[PDB]
Amino acid sequence: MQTYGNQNVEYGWWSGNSRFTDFSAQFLAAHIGQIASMTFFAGSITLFELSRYNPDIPLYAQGFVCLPQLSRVGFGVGAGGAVVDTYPFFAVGMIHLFAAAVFGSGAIFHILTGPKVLADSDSAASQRFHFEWDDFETQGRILGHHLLFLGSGALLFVVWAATHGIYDPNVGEVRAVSPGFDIVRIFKYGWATPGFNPFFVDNLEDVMGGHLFIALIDIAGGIYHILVKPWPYTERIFTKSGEALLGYALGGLGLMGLVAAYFCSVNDVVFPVEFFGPVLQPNLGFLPNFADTLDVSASGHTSRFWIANFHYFWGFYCIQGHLFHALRASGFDFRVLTKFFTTETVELG
Amino acid sequence: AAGYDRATTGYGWWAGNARLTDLSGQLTGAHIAHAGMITFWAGAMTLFEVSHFIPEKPMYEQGSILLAHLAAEGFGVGPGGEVISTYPYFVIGAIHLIASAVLGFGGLYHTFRGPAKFEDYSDWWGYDWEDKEKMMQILGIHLIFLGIGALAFAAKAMFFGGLYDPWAPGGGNVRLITNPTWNLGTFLGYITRSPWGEGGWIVSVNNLEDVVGGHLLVGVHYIFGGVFHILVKPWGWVRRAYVWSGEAYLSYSLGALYMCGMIAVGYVWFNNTVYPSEFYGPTAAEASQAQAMTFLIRDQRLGYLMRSPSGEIIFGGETMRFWDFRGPWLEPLRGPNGLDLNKLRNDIQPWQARRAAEYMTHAPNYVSPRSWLSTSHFCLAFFFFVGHIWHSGRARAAAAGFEKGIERKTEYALSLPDID
Amino acid sequence: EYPWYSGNSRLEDPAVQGKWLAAHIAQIALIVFWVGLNTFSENQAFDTSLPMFDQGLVLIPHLAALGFGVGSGGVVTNTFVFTQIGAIHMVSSFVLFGGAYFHAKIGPSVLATDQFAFSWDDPKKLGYILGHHLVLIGTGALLFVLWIKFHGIYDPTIGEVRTVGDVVLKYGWFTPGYNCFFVDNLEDLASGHLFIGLVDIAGGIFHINVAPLPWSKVVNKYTYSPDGLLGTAIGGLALMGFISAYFCAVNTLVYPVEFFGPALEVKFGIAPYFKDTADLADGFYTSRAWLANITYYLAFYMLQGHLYHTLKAMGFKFEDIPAVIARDT
Amino acid sequence: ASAWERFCSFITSTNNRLYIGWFGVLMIPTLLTAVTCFVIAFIGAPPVDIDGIREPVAGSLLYGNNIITGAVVPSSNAIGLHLYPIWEAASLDEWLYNGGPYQLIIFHYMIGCICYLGRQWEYSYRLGMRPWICVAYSAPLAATYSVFLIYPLGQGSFSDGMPLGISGTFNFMFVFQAEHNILMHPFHMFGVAGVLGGSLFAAMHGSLVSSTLVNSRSLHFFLGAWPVVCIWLTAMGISTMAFNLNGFNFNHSIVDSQGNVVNTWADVLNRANLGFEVMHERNA
Ligand code: CL7
Ligand SMILES: CC1=C(/C=C/C(C)=C/C=C/C(C)=C/C=C/C=C(C)/C=C/C=C(C)/C=C/C2=C[C@H](C)[C@H](O)CC2(C)C)C(C)(C)C[C@@H](O)C1
Ligand SMILES: CC1=C(/C=C/C(C)=C/C=C/C(C)=C/C=C/C=C(C)/C=C/C=C(C)/C=C/C2=C[C@H](C)[C@H](O)CC2(C)C)C(C)(C)C[C@@H](O)C1
Ligand SMILES: CC1=C(/C=C/C(C)=C/C=C/C(C)=C/C=C/C=C(C)/C=C/C=C(C)/C=C/C2=C[C@H](C)[C@H](O)CC2(C)C)C(C)(C)C[C@@H](O)C1
Ligand SMILES: [Fe+2]
């Protein structure tokens, strides 16, 4: 944590989650529980949406976030975005619920298994997992393994799109997609030269090639981080503390949330119109909005509207939380703000 | 005997029960005996009204109120508010009388035979008023029992016979509710409805689905709240914002009961759904509108409406004060903007035309069950408000210490700076 | 020491072991007792003319599926078989009550033959007990298989009872010609039941024969205990209940539409449930709906109880919970 | 000395000229609103369609009336029990025409009265005395709530409420007598006994004390209790009559042996009620 100066700080229950920042086993338990919550949301919401699905109503008119996402990636969608068979959605949600139960069981296991600290546990092999908030070598290996998992996921997406096929609004029906590979076109999407704009990708072939590239990059980076200790300059720049790593991750997540929010409202290929609804338009009054570009009269809002706005707010407040945690981890205590209207300088490290 | 005199307690005979404040066992006996009294009255009155029941006359003409409560729940009734057999009423009355016998036995046993102060016998049953945790837990247990009761009523309405729904087609009919309402928006719209004529606070419920869903919701909440009370302590601010003594708890209960009594009066006087007009007779609004419609029927047979302040079609005369009244026999002759004249020209089915006159005669010589219940419980509610004030003031003063008079030599008013 | 409301926790003591055994015997008697009693009342209230999925008959349809008074389908011709089965179960109940009372107060207070006597931390003892129970379970499965071979159960596609290939290794993969929850072949049911009986008997032989191994003693961190064993059993029960509820909701070959009513639709509000998809009268539900929903929610609360007992089995005490909420006021 | 604490010590302080207290926090705005609107609507206010028949009835000073005949007319018959806030009105002139000021006044006034009772209790507490002045004050409170709130509720509209005026009160009394025969209701007889006996006991007590001053505690207890109990009873009587549970009726009681009917005083009283009623009830 931070504990400006004085150690052994006392936290109220409102900020009570900072108590286990030093208990590696409990840290593991909390995060396994959180991942359980995420996958439980996926499965349970899939079923909750299936319960009230109307084939007559267009998919985006009714309030869904999961049926469009499943129908996009194959999974029982006919020609012209028609939900022919509604059983694969049930299967997907059920697998998600089973996974959630597994994760939650692991969470309780670790919360009650042994000592709070993973150094003391006499497993003699769980001690291989005890980490520190100062050592960058172990955290580099951890980063490498997690990048390996992400790259393996991108690879799985590439394979599933190659074999099972995937929906293509330009084609108009589920279709296998050849994995492209053109580093030149990847970099041209990087520059956003006039032909290629990253948020206006038109061919699923380009998307598939980019995903292949991402998988390769993530796997290579994972290997590299597992093998190689961080360089000294990365110790010079970054502080070594838990809240600092939370700040870095929060900044990254806020950026990714904003990117995904903009992606939803604009791209029509990777977010097909028949499932999510017509494209939005970005407005800026006091705060950014996404206008539905459609008469909300007797149609509510398209699912794309909800996804885009929710993730704009998620990204913005992840940025604000990143600022808060980076300010703390660098050394700034906000209590000094109370000295604003006095003659004492409102400033410290 | 000792402690049963004025000298040893300080209370005159006319305040004798006050002596029971700190005698746990006898106080419990008194409560149990009083509960026995209540259920004995219920059973005895049920048996009386059954013994004097007459199948041809309506309940409200016949003059029965405990029977109408059972009739609403559908015990031995049929479509159109017709009894089939008065046996289940006898069953209920007999069960209540037996329960009263058992409760009276328990009350006598704790009053005289059993321990006088449970604190001596045990500690779960030994309680002192100023133990905040113990009182919290007891309140929680009884809350759980209430929640079970509410869920029981919902379960009866959904699986066991149901309730007499007077919005079933062709007059009322006993129904089993299958689609309870559970949308929270509906619940908030009910709570935050204006208590004034601008709707009705909770008295304005008109379908039985909402009733059953509401009882489901409240039973769940009561069970949860009871568990919460058992499992937690009173917060610091809670400990500092109340008075902790027996009389204070009594005063709180009195206030709650006064509020409930007023609301019950409102229900029995303005509601025709959970108090079917087939049994309790027509409400005042229903009676006035039935009179207006019957006169209109006669005048249309031999060869009067108007515009609402909002411009709809309503009846004319005094009855305009009931322009928004909704009824089962009148609802089919509705329209987007008030009851259409064309509809009244040829849409009056025979049973509605019979109900109109049958209600016109029995306008609340003849006193409706609604009149009895409303008057009795308004008077009871007012007196319970008075009792709430009396006991709350006494509790506050006694906790402060100046209950038995002002102190001659340390009088507080004598120390304040004169305002002039 | 335990209070009266938690009185059965007293049986946890190895000081009074045999009495503990008595309780279990009694339970089974009660169970089989109900199997009689319920049926009798059902046989009283069962009209033959009406469809069998309207009135509160749960066991009668189960017997109807197992032949027992069905001809060309939708045929009830003898209610005496149901009464016979109920009477058999209820009479067995008296024997089981007798054994329960023999161990409760006549038999030894503690088993400490001694071959039956065991301890909560004797993995060989539990291994052989487990083997024997598995052998009996597989024996019952094979008995059902024999019943299929000889008597034969009702089939809807054939419209009548009939008697009777291991592609089970593909059903387990849920390949699109599979998802066993949609079985529609009597031969599939019979073959799978043969397989499960064989595997159960093999496992029972193995467990009697071989003691628990260290590799699997690693993972069983705390189950060698009363609370742990109870928790694992409860979790298994909940799993089975979920599977049975889904089978009842979806499958029609085993549960014919004649006696159970049409299939159920899985719906979800705040919590899951199963809707009729049948135009039954308002306030009435098919027997299939009752079975699926009650089974499922019993299994759900079995899962909750499994969590409770498992947590108590590991290092956790629930009575500490208010105290925690006391400190962080 | 937190700002909130300073505020609380200000309000719940026994050094103001008039005690405010938490109940007085509600009492003061509501009472001021009621008084202001009453004064304004009693001096000048348009005629009000009391009968809900597009025909108005005037009650203000600037429209011709004097103190004896002026009044604040009850809200219109068409409104019923509907609250009629200004912002819920079509037009200000219309809102006056339907009798909104009456609703405003009576609602603020009733809330202020109940808060005044609370304030009485609160100051009795703050001074250290037994807190039962409020119990005694609860009787006239019940009476006002009867005439202004409960009776219209039973009758379905505020048009049946009591007018706020000297002659309006008498008109209310006569219509009430016509429709419910209150005189022959025992609770009103208890109320009459209460007021007359209260005056009797007041005169006796005052004469005795002022003559000799040149259990005795139970004397003052009885003084306090008697009229209060009787006023509770008569307020309850009015409330019951608000639910059509009318008083005694002895019309057509004695009959001649052959079959004729011999009049008694009750028949004369009924005929007087008949006159009052037929003059009421504009149409039928
Ligand atoms: C009327 C206001 C009122 C209410 C509604 C009320 N109390 Mg009291 N009340 C108590 C309980 C109570 C409970 C449990 C309770 C709610 O159920 C109430 N109260 C309610 C006891 C703790 C405590 C002791 C009570 C005690 O010991 O004895 C009670 C005394 C008597 C004479 C009861 C006889 C009743 C009267 C003859 C009324 C007649 C009504 C009529 C029959 C109805 C039918 C019609 C008929 C004509 C056919 C108490 C008191 C007391 C008083 C007073 C003045 C009150 N109260 C007043 C109220 C004590 O001095 C006194 C007190 O506290 O002194 C310290
Ligand atoms: C600079 C610096 C710092 C900052 C360091 C930071 C935060 C640097 C920021 C780095 C960022 C923002 C990196 C972002 C990289 C983005 C990448 C690598 C994008 C990859 C996207 C791909 C591969 C898209 C792929 C496809 C996917 C999609 C289908 C498209 O249709 C087409 C297609 C196929 C191209 C500090 C502050 C930490 C320390 C300082 O002292 C130094
Ligand atoms: C590994 C691990 C553990 C978990 C261990 C567990 C709980 C593992 C879970 C094991 C399970 C759930 C096993 C389930 C096995 C299910 C089987 C074998 C099903 C058999 C079904 C058959 C054969 C059905 C047969 C038919 C029957 C039916 C008639 C059909 O019409 C036809 C047909 C053929 C499909 C712990 C608890 C030890 C510790 C954890 O931390 C990690
Ligand atoms: C025993 C014990 C305790 C614990 C006690 C507990 C917590 C007991 C728990 C009890 C529970 C929660 C039991 C749950 C029972 C579940 C039931 C009865 C299921 C009902 C489902 C029904 C009735 C069907 C509902 C439908 C009916 C119809 C078909 C609809 O279309 C759909 C559908 C399926 C929902 C304490 C706490 C008291 C003390 C401890 O020391 C020991
Ligand atoms: Fe005096």
Automatic annotation (TrEMBL), chain A:
GO molecular function terms noted in the UniProt entry: chlorophyll binding
Gene Ontology cellular component terms for the protein in this record: photosystem; plasma membrane-derived thylakoid membrane
GO biological process assignments: photosynthetic electron transport chain
Membrane-topology annotation of the record: Multi-pass membrane protein
Record's subcellular location: Cellular thylakoid membrane
Pfam hit, one: PSII
SUPFAM superfamilies assigned to the protein according to its UniProt record, in alphabetical order: Photosystem II antenna protein-like
Main location: membrane
Keywords: Chlorophyll, Chromophore, Membrane, Photosynthesis, Thylakoid, Transmembrane, Transmembrane helix
Spans through the membrane: 23-47, 89-112, 147-167, 207-224, 245-263
NCBIfam families reported in the protein's UniProt record: PS_antenn_a_b
Name of the featured protein: High light inducible protein
Organism of provenance: Acaryochloris marina (strain MBIC 11017)
UniProtKB/TrEMBL annotation, chain B:
TM helices/strands, residue ranges: 87-109, 138-159, 216-237, 249-270
UniProt-annotated binding residues for [CaMn4O5] cluster: E331
Keywords noted in UniProt: Chlorophyll, Chromophore, Manganese, Membrane, Metal-binding, Photosynthesis, Photosystem II, Thylakoid, Transmembrane, Transmembrane helix
GO biological process assignments: photosynthetic electron transport in photosystem II
Pfam families attached to this UniProt entry: PSII
One annotated Gene Ontology cellular component of this protein: photosystem II
Membrane topology: Multi-pass membrane protein
GO molecular function list: chlorophyll binding; metal ion binding
Compartment annotation: Cellular thylakoid membrane
Biological role: One of the components of the core complex of photosystem II (PSII). It binds chlorophyll and helps catalyze the primary light-induced photochemical processes of PSII. PSII is a light-driven water:plastoquinone oxidoreductase, using light energy to abstract electrons from H(2)O, generating O(2) and a proton gradient subsequently used for ATP formation.
Family: Belongs to the PsbB/PsbC family. PsbC subfamily.
Oligomeric form and interacting partners: PSII is composed of 1 copy each of membrane proteins PsbA, PsbB, PsbC, PsbD, PsbE, PsbF, PsbH, PsbI, PsbJ, PsbK, PsbL, PsbM, PsbT, PsbX, PsbY, PsbZ, Psb30/Ycf12, peripheral proteins PsbO, CyanoQ (PsbQ), PsbU, PsbV and a large number of cofactors. It forms dimeric complexes.
Protein name per the record: Photosystem II CP43 reaction center protein
Native species: Acaryochloris marina (strain MBIC 11017)
Gene that produces this protein: psbC
Automatic annotation (TrEMBL), chain C:
Entry GO terms, CC: photosystem; plasma membrane-derived thylakoid membrane
Compartment(s) where it occurs, according to its Swiss-Prot or TrEMBL record: Cellular thylakoid membrane
Keywords from the named record: Chlorophyll, Chromophore, Membrane, Photosynthesis, Thylakoid, Transmembrane, Transmembrane helix
Transferase recorded as keyword: no
Keyword field contains Transmembrane: yes
GO molecular function: chlorophyll binding
Location, primary (coarse class): membrane
UniProt topology in membrane: Multi-pass membrane protein
Membrane-crossing residue ranges in chain numbering: 20-37, 57-75, 81-102, 126-148, 194-216, 228-254, 289-308
Any one biological process term the GO annotation gives: photosynthetic electron transport chain
Record's protein name: High light inducible protein
Origin species: Acaryochloris marina (strain MBIC 11017)
Lineage, opening ranks: Bacteria, Bacillati, Cyanobacteriota, Cyanophyceae, Acaryochloridales
Encoding gene (name): hli
